[PDB]
Amino acid sequence: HSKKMEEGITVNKFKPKTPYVGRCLLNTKITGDDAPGETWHMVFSHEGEIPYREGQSVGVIPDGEDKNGKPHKLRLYSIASSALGDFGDAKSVSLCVKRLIYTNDAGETIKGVCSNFLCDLKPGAEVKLTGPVGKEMLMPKDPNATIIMLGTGTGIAPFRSFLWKMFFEKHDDYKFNGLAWLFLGVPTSSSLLYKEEFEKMKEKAPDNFRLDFAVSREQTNEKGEKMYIQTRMAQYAVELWEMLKKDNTYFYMCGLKGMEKGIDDIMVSLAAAEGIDWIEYKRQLKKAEQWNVLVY
Ligand SMILES: Cc1cc2nc3c(=O)[nH]c(=O)nc-3n(C[C@H](O)[C@H](O)[C@H](O)COP(=O)(O)OP(=O)(O)OC[C@H]3O[C@@H](n4cnc5c(N)ncnc54)[C@H](O)[C@@H]3O)c2cc1C
């Protein structure tokens, strides 16, 4: 029995040995020039060949060979579009990709293989895809569920997928009527991803959608602390902790590995304050499919 929309999902229809070859339709930079690092939203054509569901990922095999002449390893990317897609016809898939650039030991600049291949794609270019992959980030079956979403950076991807389904589409068998609450933590205002879309959703379903942004380098709390995602969340601690006590509440976290630790630190304290061991409570929540995490 599952609390998530797991029935009839498709997994690994396309594999690394036999990828699906799609084509780039659009590739747009969605962060301002201010932003530390660039993030691109790209859409690929798949002609209905990849039957994915909100919350899943696709693997991308970047062009070229590794230092051993073999083809590159695949890299996974959460799908940023709902099942119907940005165009509403179930024939395209969209990704949210941050261009990775770092420096090695010798002080030389190294560009990440797959992220740079992807952000450099031009409309018409082909791309090898695999998947769909995953069950961890699927949506709850319950249309009246309280869904709390916490993402950092590109971790916004699966939540854009969820929200398009919930607020931008009409479905024969699904009408969301619960409360969705999104918290998005980014470094700069120029790094807010998809804010415009979220703002329109908010106007559309003001009683079903709550929205909170945490711009670390630009906002501080009373003590004067940087506005990290948990720093903005602690401001609603009593409310969220009370929400976690209910059976119809589902927590999803996605983004940079770091975030996991800082939320756990806030939680351990709220729980102990009520005589609860967070480590055991979290375990029970994970078992009940109420605590869902995907960090990388
Ligand atoms: C399930 C899942 C979902 C994901 N979803 C997304 C998504 O939606 N968007 C997205 O952008 N990414 C996502 N990723 C990350 C993505 O898979 C790639 O890892 C990422 O894009 C970088 O890969 P690359 O091929 O560009 O880099 P690679 O060429 O593989 O380089 C990565 C290597 O760079 C090194 N490195 C990185 N930073 C530094 C540093 N500061 N100093 C030194 N070494 C460093 C690390 O050793 C790492 O092994 C996801 C990953 C997973 C597992």
Which CATH number does the domain housing residue 85 bear? Answer: 2.40.30.10
In this structure, are 159 and 291 located in the same domain? yes
Which residues have a Cβ under 8 Å from the Cβ of 13 and sit 6 or more positions away?
20, 49, 50, 51, 131, 132
H or E, element range at 167: helix 157-167
Type and span of the H or E element at 268: helix 258-272
64 Cβ closer than 6 Å to some ligand 1 atom? no
Instruction: Give yes or no: residues 141 and 123 share one domain.
Output: no
State which of 133, 161, 189 marks the end of a domain. 133
Ligand 1 pocket, 111 CB below 6 A? no
* Residue 100, ligand 1, Cβ within 6 A: yes
Beta bridge partners of 261: none
121 with 181, same domain: the answer is no
Would you tell me how many other CB atoms lie within 10 Å of the CB of residue 178?
16
CA–CA gap between residue 294 and residue 296 (Å, rounded): 7
Domain-ending residue, one of 133, 168, 192:
133
Angle between helices 157-167 and 195-204 (to 10 degrees): 30
Is any ligand 1 atom within 6 A of the Cβ of residue 130?
A: no
Residue 174, helix vs strand vs coil = coil
The burial of 233, by beta-carbon neighbours within 10 Å (0-12 exposed, 13-18 middle, 19 or more buried), is given as buried
Domain count along the chain = 2
- Give the sheet arrangement for strand 20-29, strand by strand: 75-78, 57-61, 126-133, 20-29, 39-45, 92-98
CA distances from 64 to 175, 196, 210 (A): 44, 36, 44
Ligand 1, closest atom to CA 76? 17
Nearest Cα residue to atom 51 of ligand 1 = 76
Say which experimental method was used.
X-ray
Terminal CA-to-CA distance of the chain, rounded, Å? 28
Which of 27, 73, 93, 100 has most ligand 1 atoms within 8 Å of its beta carbon, as the pocket-test mutant? Answer: 100
If you write DSSP's letter for every residue of 200-266 in order, what string do you get?
HHHHH-TTTEEEEEEETTT-B-TT--B--HHHHHGGGHHHHHHHHTSTTEEEEEEE-THHHHHHHHH
The boundaries of the domain holding residue 187 are: 134-296
The residues pairing with 292 across neighbouring beta strands, listed in sequence order, are 252
Assess whether 77 and 31 both reside in one domain.
yes
Examine the fold and report which residue of 133, 155, 177 is the final residue of a domain before the chain moves on.
Answer: 133
**Residue nearest to ligand 1 atom 9, measured at CA:** 97
Best mutation site among 75, 109, 119, 254 for ligand 1 pocket (most ligand atoms within 8 Å of CB): 75
Which atom of ligand 1 approaches the CA of 97 most closely? 11
Could you give the angle at the alpha carbon of 73 between the alpha carbons of 77 and 79, nearest 5°? 10
Beta bridge partners of 150: 183, 253
**Distance of CA 294 to CAs 37, 89, 154, 159, 272, Å?**
22, 28, 11, 12, 25
- DSSP string for 40-94: EEEEEE-TT-S---TT-EEEEE-SSB-TTSSBPPPEEEEB-S-SSTTTTSS-EEE
Angle formed at CA 101 by CA 261 and CA 34, multiple of 5 degrees = 85
Given a contact cutoff of 8 angstroms between Cβ atoms, the answer to whether 38 and 164 are in contact is: no
Q: What gap in Å lies between CA 216 and CA 229, rounded to an integer?
A: 8
CB neighbour list of residue 7: distance below 8 Å, 6 or more residues apart = none
> How close is the Cα of 256 to the center of ligand 1, in Å?
10
- For residue 30, how far is its CA from the centre of ligand 1 (angstroms)? 19
Rounded CA separation 247/285 (Å): 9
- CA 265 vs CA 56, 212, 231, 260, 268: distances in Å: 28, 20, 11, 9, 5
Residues 32 and 129 in one domain: yes
Task: Tell me how far the alpha carbon of residue 157 lies from the centroid of ligand 1, in angstroms.
Answer: 15
Give the ligand 1 atom nearest the CA of 133: 1
Q: Do 3 and 104 reside in the same domain of the chain? A: yes
Domain co-membership, 146 together with 250: yes
113 CB within 6 A, ligand 1:
yes
**How many angstroms separate the CA atoms of 208 and 181, rounded?**
8
Pair 295, 257: CB distance under 8 Å: yes
- 115 CA distance to ligand 1 centroid (A)? 7
Cβ count near 23 (within 10 Å) = 14
Check whether residue 150 and residue 287 sit in a common domain.
Answer: yes
- Produce one character per residue of 271-296: b if its CB has 16 or more CB atoms within 10 Å, e if not: beeeeeebeebbeebeeebbbbbbee
Indicate the DSSP class of residue 100.
Answer: P
φ, ψ of residue 240 in degrees (nearest 5): -70, -40
Cβ contact 216:256 at 8 Å: no
**CATH assignment of the domain containing 157:** 3.40.50.80
Residue among 162, 169, 167, 160 at smallest CA distance from 195: 160
Ligand 1 pocket test target in 43, 103, 114 with most atoms within 8 Å of CB: 114
At a CB cut-off of 8 Å and minimum separation 6, what does 246 contact? 146
Q: For the chain, state the CA radius of gyration.
A: 19
Asked if residues 216 and 202 have their Cβ atoms less than 8 Å apart, the reply is: no
> Are residue 176 and residue 257 in the same domain, yes or no?
yes
The amino acid sitting at 82 is: S
222 Cα–ligand 1 center, Å: 35
Nearest CA to 94 among 140, 127, 72? Answer: 127
Rounded CA-CA distance 293/136 in Å is: 7
Q: Is any ligand 1 atom within 6 A of the Cβ of residue 109?
A: no
Q: Which of 166, 272, 239 shows the shortest CA–CA distance to 209?
A: 166
Residues 177 and 257 in one domain: yes
CA nearest ligand 1 atom 14, residue: 77
Helix, strand, coil shares of the chain, percent, nearest 5, are 25, 30, 45
Place of tokens 């009408």: 175
- Residue 255 and residue 294 in one domain: yes
Domain shared by 74 and 7, yes or no: yes
